[PDB]
Amino acid sequence: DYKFWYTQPVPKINDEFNESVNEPFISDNKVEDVRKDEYKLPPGYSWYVCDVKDEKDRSEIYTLLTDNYVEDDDNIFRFNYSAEFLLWALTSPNYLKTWHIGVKYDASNKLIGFISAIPTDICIHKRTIKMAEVNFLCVHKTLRSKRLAPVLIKEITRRINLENIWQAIYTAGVYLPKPVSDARYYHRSINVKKLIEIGFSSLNSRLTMSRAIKLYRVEDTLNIKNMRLMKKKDVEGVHKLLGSYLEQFNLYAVFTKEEIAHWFLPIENVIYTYVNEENGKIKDMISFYSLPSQILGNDKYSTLNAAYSFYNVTTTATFKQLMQDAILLAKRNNFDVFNALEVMQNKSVFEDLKFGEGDGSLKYYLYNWKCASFAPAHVGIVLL
Ligand SMILES: CCCCCCCCCCCCCC(=O)SCCNC(=O)CCNC(=O)[C@H](O)C(C)(C)COP(=O)(O)OP(=O)(O)OC[C@H]1O[C@@H](n2cnc3c(N)ncnc32)[C@H](O)[C@@H]1OP(=O)(O)O
Ligand SMILES: Cc1c(CCOc2ccc3ccccc3c2-c2ccnc(N3CCNCC3)c2)c(C(=O)N2CCOCC2)nn1C
Ligand SMILES: [Cl-]
Ligand SMILES: [Cl-]
Ligand SMILES: [Cl-]
Ligand SMILES: [Cl-]
Ligand SMILES: [Cl-]
C-alpha cells in the first residue's frame, strides 16, 4: 500500500509526467521552518552521530552492515563493504558528519540502525540541482518490520533540510514510488571455478567445466597499450574527459576538480582507476570499485571478490575494447567477477563480452522532483 511513502513528496505509483516537466513537488522551502528537534524513538534507544574518520565508530558501522546489509534473493550472498570503503564513500568533499546517522540500543551500547547521505550536484534534464545522495540504510535483523526505516529516513531528511537542501537521489533493488529509470544488472565471470563451487554459475552437457573455463579465459594483453593507474597529475585531464562525456545523458553528477580527485584516485581494495595519456592529454579512462559479498554458510570460501563498473570513457578506441580491458584489469587485481548495469553505453558490449543477465534490476529514484521516466541508456550516474 506504501502507507509511509504516500505521505512523502514523491510520485504516486500511477503517476507519469511529460518530458518537459522538470521541477520540484514542493518549492520555496525555508530552513527556518524545519523541525529543530530529533524524531522520537522507542524507549531504550538513542540517536548517535557517527565520526567515520574514527576507527571505533567506523568499525561499529562496518559490523552493522557486515551482519545485516543486503542479501541476494537466494540468501547465499551478503554485501561486505570494507571499513576503508565506507571511509571513502562518506568523506567526499564538503561532507557533513551530521549526515552519518545511527541508532543505538542503550542497554548494550550496540549499533542497530544506520543511514547516510552526502552532498552532490546532480543534473536532471539539463538542470543542475544541489542534492543529497542517500545510501547504507540498514536496520538490524532482530528489529525488522517495526517501522524503523521511516524514522531513519525522516530524521536524515530533517538534517538535510537544515542545510537548505531539498532534493535527494537514491537507488534500491526493491520497487518504491517511484523510479525515474530501471536498469538490469549483468555479471562477467572471471574465476569460473569459484563461481561454480559456490553455486552461482551453472553447467550442462553443452558447457562442461573445462569448456566453461576456456570460454571465459581472457587474454592478458591490453587493447590500450598505455593504460596505467591514475595519479594526482591526471585530475584535470579526467575532469575534462569525464565532464565532456556525461553531458549527453539525462541524469548525471557534475564533478568539481576536488570531487574528481576523491572519487577516482586509486585506493587498494576500494577504487581502481586507469587512464591513457597521449600528447599530454587524458583521452581514455577505466574505473571500478570493490564490493565483496560474504559467501553465507560456505566452509571453503568466505567472500566473493566482485568488481563493479563505475565510469568508463574512450575517445581513441571502441567501447568494446575499453570494457574488455576493464575486465582484464579486474582480473589482474584478483577479482572473481565483473558486474555492470545497462546504463550509459554498457549494454552495447554485454553480448560480445559474454555478460550474463542477473535476476533483478536497480531502480533510480529522486526525492521531491517531478520529471518523466526514461530508459536506463539515458542514465549517466553510478551510485555505490
Ligand atoms: C531532501 C532530502 C531527502 C532525504 C531522504 C530521501 C529518501 C531516502 C530513501 C532511502 C534510501 C535507501 C538507500 C539504500 O541504501 S538501498 C538498500 C537498503 N538496505 C538494505 O536493504 C539492507 C537489508 N535490509 C534492511 O536493512 C531493512 O529491511 C530496511 C532498512 C531496508 C527496511 O526496514 P524493515 O524491512 O525493517 O521495514 P520497516 O518496518 O522499517 O518499514 C517499512 C517501510 O520501509 C520502506 N522501505 C523498504 N526497503 C526500502 C529501501 N531499500 N529504501 C527505501 N524505503 C524502503 C517500505 O516501503 C515501507 O514503506 P511503506 O511501504 O510502508 O510506505
Ligand atoms: C544483493 C546481492 C546480490 C544480488 C545481485 O546484485 C547486483 C549484481 C550486479 C550489480 C551490478 C551493478 C550494480 C548493482 C548490482 C547488484 C545490486 C543489486 C541490488 N543492490 C545493490 N546494492 C545496494 C544499493 N546500492 C548499490 C549496491 C547491488 C549478490 C550477487 O548475486 N552477486 C554479487 C557479486 O557478484 C556476483 C553476484 N550479492 N548480494 C549481496
Ligand atoms: Cl512525453
Ligand atoms: Cl599489456
Ligand atoms: Cl565510444
Ligand atoms: Cl543472459
Ligand atoms: Cl526514454
Short mmCIF file of C-alpha atoms and ligand atoms in Angstrom, two decimals:
data_model
loop_
_atom_site.label_atom_id
_atom_site.label_comp_id
_atom_site.label_asym_id
_atom_site.label_seq_id
_atom_site.Cartn_x
_atom_site.Cartn_y
_atom_site.Cartn_z
CA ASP A 1 0.00 0.00 0.00
CA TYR A 2 3.03 2.26 0.58
CA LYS A 3 1.44 3.88 3.63
CA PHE A 4 4.58 5.83 4.57
CA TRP A 5 5.68 6.79 1.06
CA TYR A 6 2.21 8.17 0.23
CA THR A 7 2.88 10.97 2.74
CA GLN A 8 6.22 11.99 1.19
CA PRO A 9 6.74 14.34 -1.79
CA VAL A 10 7.32 11.59 -4.34
CA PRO A 11 5.28 10.37 -7.32
CA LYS A 12 2.29 8.16 -6.64
CA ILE A 13 2.53 4.65 -8.06
CA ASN A 14 0.31 5.60 -11.03
CA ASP A 15 2.00 8.93 -11.80
CA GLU A 16 3.62 9.94 -15.09
CA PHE A 17 4.91 13.29 -16.30
CA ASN A 18 5.71 14.97 -19.60
CA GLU A 19 9.24 15.25 -20.98
CA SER A 20 9.14 19.00 -20.32
CA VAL A 21 8.19 18.62 -16.64
CA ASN A 22 11.31 19.19 -14.54
CA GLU A 23 10.60 20.87 -11.20
CA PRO A 24 10.09 20.04 -7.50
CA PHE A 25 6.90 18.92 -5.83
CA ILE A 26 7.36 21.45 -3.00
CA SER A 27 9.34 24.64 -3.64
CA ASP A 28 10.08 27.91 -1.82
CA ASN A 29 11.01 25.99 1.32
CA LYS A 30 12.52 27.79 4.31
CA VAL A 31 15.21 26.36 6.59
CA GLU A 32 13.72 28.50 9.38
CA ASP A 33 10.62 26.27 9.41
CA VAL A 34 12.43 22.91 9.54
CA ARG A 35 11.96 20.92 12.74
CA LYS A 36 14.80 21.59 15.18
CA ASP A 37 14.13 18.55 17.40
CA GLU A 38 15.10 14.95 16.71
CA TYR A 39 12.36 12.48 15.84
CA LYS A 40 11.32 10.46 18.87
CA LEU A 41 12.46 6.84 19.20
CA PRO A 42 11.06 3.98 21.28
CA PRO A 43 12.13 3.95 24.93
CA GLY A 44 15.61 2.49 25.29
CA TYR A 45 17.06 3.83 22.02
CA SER A 46 19.01 6.98 21.20
CA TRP A 47 20.42 8.71 18.15
CA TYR A 48 24.16 8.61 17.54
CA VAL A 49 26.16 10.79 15.16
CA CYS A 50 28.98 8.72 13.65
CA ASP A 51 32.52 10.02 13.12
CA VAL A 52 33.56 7.89 10.15
CA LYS A 53 37.13 9.20 10.48
CA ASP A 54 37.30 7.46 13.88
CA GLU A 55 38.29 3.80 13.70
CA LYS A 56 35.94 2.76 16.51
CA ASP A 57 32.84 4.44 15.07
CA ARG A 58 33.84 3.26 11.60
CA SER A 59 34.22 -0.31 12.87
CA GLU A 60 30.79 -0.16 14.53
CA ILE A 61 29.17 0.73 11.20
CA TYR A 62 31.18 -2.00 9.45
CA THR A 63 29.94 -4.67 11.86
CA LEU A 64 26.34 -3.49 11.46
CA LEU A 65 26.43 -3.68 7.66
CA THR A 66 28.56 -6.83 7.60
CA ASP A 67 25.88 -8.70 9.56
CA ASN A 68 22.64 -7.08 8.35
CA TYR A 69 23.00 -5.38 4.95
CA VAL A 70 21.61 -6.53 1.61
CA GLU A 71 21.34 -10.22 0.71
CA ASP A 72 20.62 -11.79 -2.66
CA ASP A 73 17.28 -13.39 -3.49
CA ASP A 74 18.70 -16.87 -2.73
CA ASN A 75 20.38 -15.95 0.60
CA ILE A 76 23.90 -17.05 -0.32
CA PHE A 77 25.49 -13.57 -0.52
CA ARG A 78 25.60 -10.57 1.77
CA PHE A 79 27.43 -7.37 0.86
CA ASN A 80 30.63 -6.90 2.87
CA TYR A 81 31.71 -3.28 2.41
CA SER A 82 35.19 -2.82 3.83
CA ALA A 83 35.88 -0.23 6.51
CA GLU A 84 38.15 1.70 4.14
CA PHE A 85 35.40 1.69 1.51
CA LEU A 86 32.97 3.30 3.96
CA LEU A 87 35.58 5.93 4.81
CA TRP A 88 35.96 6.66 1.10
CA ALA A 89 32.23 6.70 0.34
CA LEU A 90 31.34 9.02 3.25
CA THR A 91 34.18 11.59 3.32
CA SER A 92 33.70 13.17 -0.11
CA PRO A 93 34.42 16.91 -0.43
CA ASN A 94 32.34 19.10 1.91
CA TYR A 95 30.69 16.09 3.57
CA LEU A 96 28.73 16.60 6.80
CA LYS A 97 29.31 14.37 9.82
CA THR A 98 25.73 15.16 10.90
CA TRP A 99 24.52 13.22 7.83
CA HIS A 100 26.08 9.97 9.12
CA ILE A 101 23.25 8.92 11.41
CA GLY A 102 22.97 5.84 13.61
CA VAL A 103 20.73 4.41 16.31
CA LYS A 104 21.97 2.67 19.46
CA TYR A 105 20.40 0.18 21.85
CA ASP A 106 21.36 1.91 25.09
CA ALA A 107 21.48 -1.25 27.23
CA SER A 108 24.33 -2.82 25.24
CA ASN A 109 25.62 0.35 23.52
CA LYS A 110 25.44 -1.61 20.24
CA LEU A 111 24.61 -0.03 16.90
CA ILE A 112 21.36 -1.32 15.40
CA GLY A 113 20.46 1.18 12.67
CA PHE A 114 22.21 3.46 10.22
CA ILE A 115 21.62 5.79 7.28
CA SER A 116 23.92 8.22 5.49
CA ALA A 117 23.94 10.97 2.89
CA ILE A 118 26.50 13.10 1.04
CA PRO A 119 26.08 16.36 -0.86
CA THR A 120 26.42 16.29 -4.64
CA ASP A 121 25.42 18.43 -7.62
CA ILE A 122 23.06 16.43 -9.86
CA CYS A 123 21.94 17.42 -13.36
CA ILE A 124 18.45 16.21 -14.30
CA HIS A 125 17.06 17.04 -17.76
CA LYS A 126 19.56 19.91 -18.22
CA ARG A 127 19.02 21.42 -14.73
CA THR A 128 21.82 21.24 -12.16
CA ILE A 129 20.47 20.87 -8.61
CA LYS A 130 22.09 20.53 -5.19
CA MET A 131 21.00 17.12 -3.87
CA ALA A 132 21.82 14.58 -1.18
CA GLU A 133 22.94 11.07 -2.16
CA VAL A 134 21.46 8.61 0.36
CA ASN A 135 22.96 5.16 0.92
CA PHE A 136 23.65 2.46 3.51
CA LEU A 137 20.18 2.33 5.08
CA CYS A 138 20.29 -0.64 7.45
CA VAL A 139 18.22 -1.98 10.35
CA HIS A 140 19.36 -4.91 12.47
CA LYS A 141 17.75 -8.23 11.58
CA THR A 142 16.23 -8.62 15.06
CA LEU A 143 14.22 -5.38 14.68
CA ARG A 144 12.91 -5.75 11.12
CA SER A 145 9.28 -4.91 10.31
CA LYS A 146 8.97 -2.44 13.20
CA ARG A 147 8.62 0.77 11.14
CA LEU A 148 12.18 1.81 11.98
CA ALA A 149 13.27 2.63 8.43
CA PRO A 150 10.81 5.55 8.02
CA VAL A 151 12.17 7.16 11.19
CA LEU A 152 15.72 6.90 9.83
CA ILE A 153 14.54 8.44 6.55
CA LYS A 154 12.59 11.26 8.20
CA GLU A 155 15.44 12.13 10.58
CA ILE A 156 18.06 12.43 7.84
CA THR A 157 15.55 14.33 5.70
CA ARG A 158 15.37 16.87 8.53
CA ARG A 159 19.16 17.11 8.80
CA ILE A 160 19.43 17.71 5.04
CA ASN A 161 16.66 20.33 5.00
CA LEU A 162 18.55 22.08 7.81
CA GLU A 163 21.36 22.59 5.27
CA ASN A 164 18.92 24.23 2.81
CA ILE A 165 18.90 21.13 0.56
CA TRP A 166 15.51 19.82 -0.54
CA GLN A 167 16.25 17.16 -3.20
CA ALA A 168 17.91 13.76 -2.98
CA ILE A 169 18.90 10.81 -5.16
CA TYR A 170 18.99 7.13 -4.20
CA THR A 171 18.85 3.62 -5.64
CA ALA A 172 17.38 0.35 -4.44
CA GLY A 173 16.69 -3.13 -5.77
CA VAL A 174 13.17 -3.09 -4.34
CA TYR A 175 10.37 -1.21 -6.09
CA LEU A 176 9.20 2.01 -4.44
CA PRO A 177 7.23 5.08 -5.59
CA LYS A 178 8.64 5.83 -8.00
CA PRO A 179 11.60 5.04 -10.29
CA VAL A 180 12.78 7.53 -12.88
CA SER A 181 14.77 4.72 -14.54
CA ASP A 182 15.19 0.97 -14.08
CA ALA A 183 18.41 -0.80 -15.09
CA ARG A 184 19.02 -4.54 -15.21
CA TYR A 185 22.45 -5.62 -13.97
CA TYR A 186 24.82 -8.13 -15.56
CA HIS A 187 27.84 -10.15 -14.47
CA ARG A 188 31.01 -11.33 -16.22
CA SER A 189 32.59 -14.48 -14.80
CA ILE A 190 36.35 -14.47 -14.22
CA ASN A 191 37.10 -17.08 -11.54
CA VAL A 192 34.93 -19.70 -13.21
CA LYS A 193 35.84 -22.49 -10.78
CA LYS A 194 34.98 -20.43 -7.70
CA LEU A 195 31.69 -19.18 -9.15
CA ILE A 196 30.63 -22.81 -9.76
CA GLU A 197 31.72 -24.36 -6.45
CA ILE A 198 29.58 -21.82 -4.57
CA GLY A 199 26.60 -22.39 -6.88
CA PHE A 200 26.26 -19.07 -8.69
CA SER A 201 27.07 -20.33 -12.20
CA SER A 202 25.64 -23.45 -13.83
CA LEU A 203 26.89 -26.17 -16.18
CA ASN A 204 25.29 -28.61 -18.60
CA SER A 205 26.17 -31.16 -21.28
CA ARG A 206 26.85 -28.32 -23.72
CA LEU A 207 29.03 -26.24 -21.38
CA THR A 208 31.23 -28.51 -19.27
CA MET A 209 33.68 -27.38 -16.60
CA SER A 210 36.63 -27.35 -18.99
CA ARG A 211 34.57 -25.77 -21.79
CA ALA A 212 33.38 -23.09 -19.35
CA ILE A 213 36.96 -22.31 -18.30
CA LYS A 214 38.10 -21.87 -21.90
CA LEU A 215 35.04 -19.79 -22.77
CA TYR A 216 35.70 -17.11 -20.13
CA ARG A 217 39.50 -17.13 -20.38
CA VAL A 218 40.80 -13.60 -21.03
CA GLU A 219 43.92 -12.55 -22.91
CA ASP A 220 46.49 -10.81 -20.70
CA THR A 221 47.20 -8.06 -23.25
CA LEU A 222 45.58 -4.64 -23.10
CA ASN A 223 43.88 -3.23 -26.18
CA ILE A 224 45.01 0.22 -24.98
CA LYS A 225 48.74 -0.32 -24.54
CA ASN A 226 49.43 2.59 -22.17
CA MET A 227 46.52 2.22 -19.73
CA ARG A 228 48.03 2.99 -16.32
CA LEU A 229 46.94 3.80 -12.78
CA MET A 230 45.67 7.34 -12.31
CA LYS A 231 47.77 9.93 -10.48
CA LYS A 232 47.20 13.36 -8.96
CA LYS A 233 48.63 14.96 -12.11
CA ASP A 234 45.73 13.45 -14.11
CA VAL A 235 42.90 15.02 -12.08
CA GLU A 236 42.42 17.89 -14.53
CA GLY A 237 42.56 15.62 -17.58
CA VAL A 238 39.91 13.31 -16.13
CA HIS A 239 37.74 16.27 -15.12
CA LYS A 240 37.68 17.45 -18.74
CA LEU A 241 37.26 13.97 -20.23
CA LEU A 242 34.53 12.77 -17.88
CA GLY A 243 32.75 16.12 -17.71
CA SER A 244 32.53 16.24 -21.50
CA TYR A 245 31.28 12.65 -21.66
CA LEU A 246 28.40 12.90 -19.19
CA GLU A 247 26.67 15.92 -20.78
CA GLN A 248 24.99 13.57 -23.28
CA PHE A 249 22.82 11.96 -20.58
CA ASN A 250 19.62 12.94 -18.79
CA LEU A 251 20.86 12.20 -15.24
CA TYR A 252 24.46 12.61 -14.08
CA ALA A 253 26.63 14.28 -11.46
CA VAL A 254 28.61 17.48 -12.04
CA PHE A 255 32.08 16.98 -10.57
CA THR A 256 34.45 19.66 -9.36
CA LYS A 257 38.22 19.25 -9.50
CA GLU A 258 38.14 18.31 -5.82
CA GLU A 259 35.48 15.63 -6.35
CA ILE A 260 37.37 14.10 -9.28
CA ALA A 261 40.43 13.60 -7.08
CA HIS A 262 38.41 11.95 -4.31
CA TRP A 263 36.19 9.62 -6.34
CA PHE A 264 38.86 8.32 -8.73
CA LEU A 265 42.39 8.42 -7.28
CA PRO A 266 43.17 4.72 -6.72
CA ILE A 267 42.90 3.06 -3.32
CA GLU A 268 43.79 -0.59 -2.79
CA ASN A 269 40.71 -2.79 -2.33
CA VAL A 270 38.38 0.21 -2.78
CA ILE A 271 38.57 2.22 -6.02
CA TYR A 272 40.61 1.45 -9.15
CA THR A 273 41.09 3.98 -11.95
CA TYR A 274 43.23 3.70 -15.08
CA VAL A 275 43.93 6.32 -17.75
CA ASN A 276 45.59 6.67 -21.15
CA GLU A 277 47.68 9.80 -21.76
CA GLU A 278 48.54 10.86 -25.32
CA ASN A 279 50.22 14.17 -26.18
CA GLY A 280 49.81 15.28 -22.58
CA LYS A 281 46.03 14.76 -22.74
CA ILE A 282 43.81 12.26 -20.94
CA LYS A 283 41.84 10.51 -23.69
CA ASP A 284 40.57 7.27 -22.11
CA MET A 285 39.73 6.10 -18.60
CA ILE A 286 38.53 2.98 -16.79
CA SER A 287 37.22 2.73 -13.24
CA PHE A 288 35.67 0.12 -10.97
CA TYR A 289 35.24 -0.18 -7.20
CA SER A 290 35.48 -3.23 -4.95
CA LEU A 291 32.44 -4.63 -3.13
CA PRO A 292 32.90 -8.17 -1.80
CA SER A 293 29.98 -10.47 -0.99
CA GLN A 294 30.33 -12.75 2.02
CA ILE A 295 29.53 -16.33 0.99
CA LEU A 296 26.97 -17.38 3.60
CA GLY A 297 27.47 -20.83 5.10
CA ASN A 298 30.26 -21.94 2.77
CA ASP A 299 33.04 -23.67 4.71
CA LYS A 300 35.66 -23.22 1.96
CA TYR A 301 35.32 -19.61 0.78
CA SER A 302 34.45 -16.55 2.85
CA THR A 303 33.91 -13.80 0.26
CA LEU A 304 33.28 -13.35 -3.46
CA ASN A 305 35.58 -10.53 -4.58
CA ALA A 306 33.40 -8.63 -7.08
CA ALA A 307 34.29 -5.58 -9.16
CA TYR A 308 31.61 -3.09 -10.22
CA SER A 309 31.91 -0.91 -13.32
CA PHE A 310 31.97 2.78 -12.40
CA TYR A 311 32.83 5.30 -15.15
CA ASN A 312 34.48 4.36 -18.46
CA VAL A 313 35.21 6.82 -21.27
CA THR A 314 37.14 6.27 -24.52
CA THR A 315 37.99 8.72 -27.29
CA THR A 316 40.71 6.76 -29.15
CA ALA A 317 39.22 3.23 -29.22
CA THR A 318 35.87 1.45 -29.21
CA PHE A 319 33.77 0.96 -26.10
CA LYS A 320 34.04 -2.78 -26.76
CA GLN A 321 37.83 -2.62 -26.49
CA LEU A 322 37.50 -0.41 -23.41
CA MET A 323 35.27 -2.65 -21.29
CA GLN A 324 37.31 -5.63 -22.47
CA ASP A 325 40.38 -4.01 -20.90
CA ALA A 326 38.38 -3.22 -17.76
CA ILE A 327 37.69 -6.94 -17.29
CA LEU A 328 41.38 -7.77 -17.70
CA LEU A 329 42.38 -5.06 -15.24
CA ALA A 330 39.90 -6.50 -12.75
CA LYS A 331 41.35 -9.97 -13.36
CA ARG A 332 44.90 -8.72 -12.82
CA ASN A 333 43.80 -7.43 -9.39
CA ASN A 334 42.39 -10.82 -8.29
CA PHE A 335 38.68 -10.07 -8.74
CA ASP A 336 36.35 -13.04 -9.18
CA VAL A 337 33.66 -11.32 -11.29
CA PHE A 338 32.91 -8.06 -13.12
CA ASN A 339 29.44 -6.54 -12.73
CA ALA A 340 27.81 -3.64 -14.56
CA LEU A 341 24.45 -2.02 -15.28
CA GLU A 342 22.69 -1.29 -18.57
CA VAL A 343 23.37 2.43 -18.18
CA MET A 344 25.41 4.76 -20.43
CA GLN A 345 26.87 2.65 -23.30
CA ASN A 346 27.31 -0.54 -21.25
CA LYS A 347 24.52 -2.51 -22.92
CA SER A 348 26.20 -2.42 -26.34
CA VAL A 349 29.01 -4.77 -25.20
CA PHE A 350 27.30 -7.33 -22.95
CA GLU A 351 26.67 -9.97 -25.62
CA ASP A 352 30.07 -9.53 -27.27
CA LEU A 353 31.96 -9.73 -23.96
CA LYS A 354 29.90 -12.67 -22.62
CA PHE A 355 28.00 -10.98 -19.80
CA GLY A 356 25.12 -12.81 -18.15
CA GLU A 357 21.83 -11.19 -17.18
CA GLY A 358 21.15 -11.19 -13.45
CA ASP A 359 17.97 -11.89 -11.54
CA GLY A 360 16.78 -8.36 -10.79
CA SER A 361 17.27 -4.68 -11.58
CA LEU A 362 18.39 -1.49 -9.85
CA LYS A 363 15.95 1.44 -9.69
CA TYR A 364 16.90 5.12 -9.67
CA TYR A 365 14.82 7.47 -7.51
CA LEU A 366 14.58 11.20 -6.88
CA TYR A 367 13.07 12.87 -3.81
CA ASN A 368 10.88 15.96 -4.26
CA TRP A 369 11.32 16.25 -8.02
CA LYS A 370 8.87 15.85 -10.91
CA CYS A 371 10.21 14.57 -14.22
CA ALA A 372 9.47 11.93 -16.82
CA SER A 373 10.89 8.43 -16.53
CA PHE A 374 13.41 7.35 -19.16
CA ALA A 375 15.28 4.31 -20.40
CA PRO A 376 18.43 3.30 -18.48
CA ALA A 377 20.56 4.12 -21.55
CA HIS A 378 19.93 7.79 -20.67
CA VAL A 379 21.27 7.34 -17.12
CA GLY A 380 24.77 8.70 -16.61
CA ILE A 381 25.46 8.06 -12.93
CA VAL A 382 26.51 5.05 -10.83
CA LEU A 383 25.92 5.00 -7.07
CA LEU A 384 27.98 2.92 -4.66
C1 LIG B 1 15.81 16.31 0.51
C2 LIG B 1 16.44 15.23 1.42
C3 LIG B 1 15.66 13.89 1.48
C4 LIG B 1 16.44 12.69 2.08
C5 LIG B 1 15.68 11.34 2.11
C6 LIG B 1 15.22 10.79 0.72
C7 LIG B 1 14.60 9.36 0.71
C8 LIG B 1 15.52 8.22 1.21
C9 LIG B 1 15.04 6.75 1.00
C10 LIG B 1 16.01 5.65 1.50
C11 LIG B 1 17.20 5.31 0.54
C12 LIG B 1 17.82 3.89 0.66
C13 LIG B 1 19.23 3.68 0.05
C14 LIG B 1 19.85 2.28 0.21
O1 LIG B 1 20.78 2.11 0.96
S1 LIG B 1 19.17 0.82 -0.74
C15 LIG B 1 19.34 -0.82 0.21
C16 LIG B 1 18.77 -0.72 1.65
N1 LIG B 1 19.42 -1.59 2.67
C17 LIG B 1 19.11 -2.95 2.89
O2 LIG B 1 18.25 -3.45 2.18
C18 LIG B 1 19.78 -3.85 3.95
C19 LIG B 1 18.94 -5.03 4.48
N2 LIG B 1 17.57 -4.64 4.84
C20 LIG B 1 17.23 -3.72 5.85
O3 LIG B 1 18.15 -3.22 6.50
C21 LIG B 1 15.73 -3.33 6.19
O4 LIG B 1 14.95 -4.35 5.66
C22 LIG B 1 15.33 -1.94 5.59
C23 LIG B 1 16.15 -0.83 6.30
C24 LIG B 1 15.62 -1.89 4.10
C25 LIG B 1 13.75 -1.67 5.83
O5 LIG B 1 13.39 -1.95 7.10
P1 LIG B 1 12.27 -3.01 7.52
O6 LIG B 1 12.38 -4.06 6.46
O7 LIG B 1 12.78 -3.38 8.88
O8 LIG B 1 10.91 -2.21 7.41
P2 LIG B 1 10.18 -1.06 8.23
O9 LIG B 1 9.16 -1.77 9.05
O10 LIG B 1 11.25 -0.24 8.89
O11 LIG B 1 9.37 -0.04 7.33
C26 LIG B 1 8.88 -0.37 6.07
C27 LIG B 1 8.91 0.83 5.07
O12 LIG B 1 10.24 0.98 4.51
C28 LIG B 1 10.15 1.07 3.10
N3 LIG B 1 11.41 0.51 2.52
C29 LIG B 1 11.81 -0.83 2.49
N4 LIG B 1 13.01 -1.00 1.88
C30 LIG B 1 13.41 0.29 1.48
C31 LIG B 1 14.55 0.80 0.81
N5 LIG B 1 15.58 -0.04 0.38
N6 LIG B 1 14.65 2.14 0.56
C32 LIG B 1 13.61 2.94 1.00
N7 LIG B 1 12.49 2.60 1.64
C33 LIG B 1 12.39 1.23 1.89
C34 LIG B 1 8.93 0.26 2.70
O13 LIG B 1 8.42 0.80 1.52
C35 LIG B 1 7.92 0.65 3.83
O14 LIG B 1 7.23 1.72 3.48
P3 LIG B 1 5.69 1.71 3.10
O15 LIG B 1 5.64 0.61 2.07
O16 LIG B 1 5.08 1.40 4.46
O17 LIG B 1 5.39 3.10 2.58
C1 LIG B 2 22.28 -8.40 -3.04
C2 LIG B 2 23.38 -9.30 -3.61
C3 LIG B 2 23.43 -9.84 -4.87
C4 LIG B 2 22.39 -9.68 -5.98
C5 LIG B 2 22.97 -9.07 -7.26
O1 LIG B 2 23.12 -7.69 -7.05
C6 LIG B 2 23.79 -6.95 -8.04
C7 LIG B 2 24.50 -7.56 -9.07
C8 LIG B 2 25.15 -6.79 -10.03
C9 LIG B 2 25.09 -5.37 -9.96
C10 LIG B 2 25.76 -4.59 -10.95
C11 LIG B 2 25.72 -3.21 -10.90
C12 LIG B 2 25.01 -2.57 -9.87
C13 LIG B 2 24.35 -3.33 -8.91
C14 LIG B 2 24.40 -4.76 -8.96
C15 LIG B 2 23.73 -5.56 -7.97
C16 LIG B 2 22.94 -4.92 -6.83
C17 LIG B 2 21.59 -5.21 -6.67
C18 LIG B 2 20.91 -4.60 -5.63
N1 LIG B 2 21.50 -3.76 -4.79
C19 LIG B 2 22.79 -3.48 -4.93
N2 LIG B 2 23.41 -2.55 -3.99
C20 LIG B 2 22.61 -1.88 -2.92
C21 LIG B 2 22.19 -0.46 -3.28
N3 LIG B 2 23.23 0.36 -3.75
C22 LIG B 2 24.06 -0.23 -4.73
C23 LIG B 2 24.52 -1.64 -4.39
C24 LIG B 2 23.54 -4.04 -5.94
C25 LIG B 2 24.59 -10.59 -4.95
C26 LIG B 2 25.06 -11.38 -6.18
O2 LIG B 2 24.37 -12.24 -6.59
N4 LIG B 2 26.33 -11.09 -6.85
C27 LIG B 2 27.24 -10.06 -6.42
C28 LIG B 2 28.70 -10.41 -6.64
O3 LIG B 2 28.97 -10.71 -7.98
C29 LIG B 2 28.19 -11.78 -8.48
C30 LIG B 2 26.74 -11.85 -8.00
N5 LIG B 2 25.22 -10.49 -3.79
N6 LIG B 2 24.46 -9.69 -2.97
C31 LIG B 2 24.80 -9.34 -1.61
CL CL B 3 6.43 12.86 -23.14
CL CL B 4 49.50 -5.43 -21.64
CL CL B 5 32.56 5.04 -27.82
CL CL B 6 21.84 -13.96 -20.39
CL CL B 7 13.19 7.09 -22.90
#
